[PDB]
Amino acid sequence: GASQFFKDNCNRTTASLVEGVELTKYISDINNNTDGMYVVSSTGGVWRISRAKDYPDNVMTAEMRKIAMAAVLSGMRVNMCASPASSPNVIWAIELEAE
Amino acid sequence: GASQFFKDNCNRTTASLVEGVELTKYISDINNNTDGMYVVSSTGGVWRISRAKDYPDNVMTAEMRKIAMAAVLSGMRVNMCASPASSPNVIWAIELEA
Amino acid sequence: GASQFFKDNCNRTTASLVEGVELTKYISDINNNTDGMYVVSSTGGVWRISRAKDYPDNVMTAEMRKIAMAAVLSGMRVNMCASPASSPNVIWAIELEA
Amino acid sequence: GASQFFKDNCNRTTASLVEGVELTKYISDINNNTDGMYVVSSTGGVWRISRAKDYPDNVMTAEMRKIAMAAVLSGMRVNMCASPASSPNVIWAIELEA
Amino acid sequence: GASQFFKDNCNRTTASLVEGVELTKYISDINNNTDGMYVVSSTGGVWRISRAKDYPDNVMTAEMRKIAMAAVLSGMRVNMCASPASSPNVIWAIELEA
């Protein structure tokens, strides 16, 4: 399960906690209006990975991408803190877990 | 198979959906006129990977390259949204699947 | 255990040495106030990865992130030099060990 | 063997096609006059990886380096389009094959 | 053993050739005075990887760091061309071997 630190952090926001997600697809799209980076879960849920041009969020968003790839390749689960304001929901934090 | 999301998004465009592709070769070329990044499938199909200098497309295009390498190394399948307007067809979206 | 070199370096500083840590979670967060990169140990300990905007520290911080990911994927242990001035403690140096 | 696409592209040039090469060593050098990135095959052949500072060839040359490392780690073979004009021969295109 | 090419290149310089090294630790440090990237061998030898902000050495130095991590993760041996003018000795060239 999600670390208590990860849960506490997500609980201070308007975003929602999703635990123990198996990501089975990773999408890169440059088409008009659908452009972005996405992940799809084993049950068909879809989330947008945040992007940012400048420091310091350019670092965190790059690491969210690496976490997504690593999850898809390995079958390791993730915990997400995702805003329900938009569709697909935007990932504001993510936790890769080995166990 | 391709996610419904991926399919819906490709369906909005002039590009073609290609599902369950096994990529077996990855090409980097700097020669005049053939310069680019390409992938080749197990049946001999060839696609050009999109490129972009600036943000935000420089992110997506970098991740296309990472998906292509990961598919070649692992034998994981991909789904593509590829324009037939040129040869080789250009990848506008790609989905790596476990 | 930590190399003597790593131990000596950490000893010059106000930071604390932590040896033989198994990292099992890796966190990226962009939320207000909690924004950052973190690692979590197998027993629940939490550390923040250093960030830096400019050269040369942004090189070293990038490699800390790579070490963290590699440790989580592989189960390889790390040794850390971490400052108690903030919570979670900030990683000033890290050593990945085979 | 090399894809027909890869062969056709190399055929347009003054470079030579080399097929089914096992790369066993990967070299980074910053010494005066020998500075560069190189690969060494299982028979002892040496090639220089192309380098470029600007877009778009900075993308392709980075992917050549990624291909070279991936080949060394995995034992996956490569096909090269390499110019005999210099020594070591310079890689103008490379194909990683599963 | 080290390629003839690698040996010849090191033998042009005042540096020392070290062959068949097993790297077991990789270090990233941002602390004053010890800041840098280092590797430690299975026998406790320590070497520093150089840093460079600009092209072209920013490429070669990045690849030295990739070689170091790959060696630590895999147990693949390296050959080094290392100068005794600094302590730890500085890596001027490195060769990863399968």
Ligand SMILES: CC(=O)N[C@H]1[C@H]([C@H](O)[C@H](O)CO)O[C@@](O[C@@H]2[C@@H](O)[C@H](O)O[C@H](CO)[C@@H]2O)(C(=O)O)C[C@@H]1O
């Ligand atoms: C990624 C991120 O910024 N997350 C914020 C979030 C967004 O900025 C906001 O919802 C716009 O999309 O804002 C959060 O709420 C903030 C409050 O904590 C603060 O009192 O007031 C802020 C506006 O001045 C903002 O509403 C949220 O929605 O939970 C915090 C979250 O980290």
Ligand SMILES: CC(=O)N[C@H]1[C@H]([C@H](O)[C@H](O)CO)O[C@@](O[C@@H]2[C@@H](O)[C@H](O)O[C@H](CO)[C@@H]2O)(C(=O)O)C[C@@H]1O
């Ligand atoms: C990657 C990308 O930009 N994809 C676009 C695509 C191309 O921009 C375009 O084909 C030129 O290379 O354009 C798409 O929509 C086109 C419209 O912009 C155009 O006005 O009308 C076209 C119909 O013939 C078409 O609608 C496309 O070709 O599907 C949208 C796509 O995301």
Ligand SMILES: CC(=O)N[C@H]1[C@H]([C@H](O)[C@H](O)CO)O[C@@](O[C@@H]2[C@@H](O)[C@H](O)O[C@H](CO)[C@@H]2O)(C(=O)O)C[C@@H]1O
């Ligand atoms: C990587 C690259 O630029 N490759 C080119 C190559 C080089 O630009 C050139 O050899 C200098 O390194 O040039 C090629 O085209 C050549 C023409 O530039 C030359 O005028 O005539 C040559 C025939 O003797 C040749 O056509 C080449 O050498 O093949 C094309 C290649 O993509």
Ligand SMILES: CC(=O)N[C@H]1[C@H]([C@H](O)[C@H](O)CO)O[C@@](O)(C(=O)O)C[C@@H]1O
């Ligand atoms: C990462 C870093 O810079 N660490 C350095 C710190 C910090 O600059 C200050 O504590 C202010 O945070 O200063 C030292 O004197 C210390 O406290 O040991 C040396 C150390 O190398």
Ligand SMILES: CC(=O)N[C@H]1[C@H]([C@H](O)[C@H](O)CO)O[C@@](O)(C(=O)O)C[C@@H]1O
């Ligand atoms: C692929 C290619 O032609 N690379 C050449 C580059 C590029 O022209 C520039 O770096 C601009 O991208 O210039 C060099 O002096 C270099 O950087 O080593 C020689 C090299 O052959």
Ligand code: NA
């Ligand atoms: Na909430």
Ligand code: NA
């Ligand atoms: Na379509």
Ligand code: NA
């Ligand atoms: Na100390």
Ligand code: NA
């Ligand atoms: Na030719």
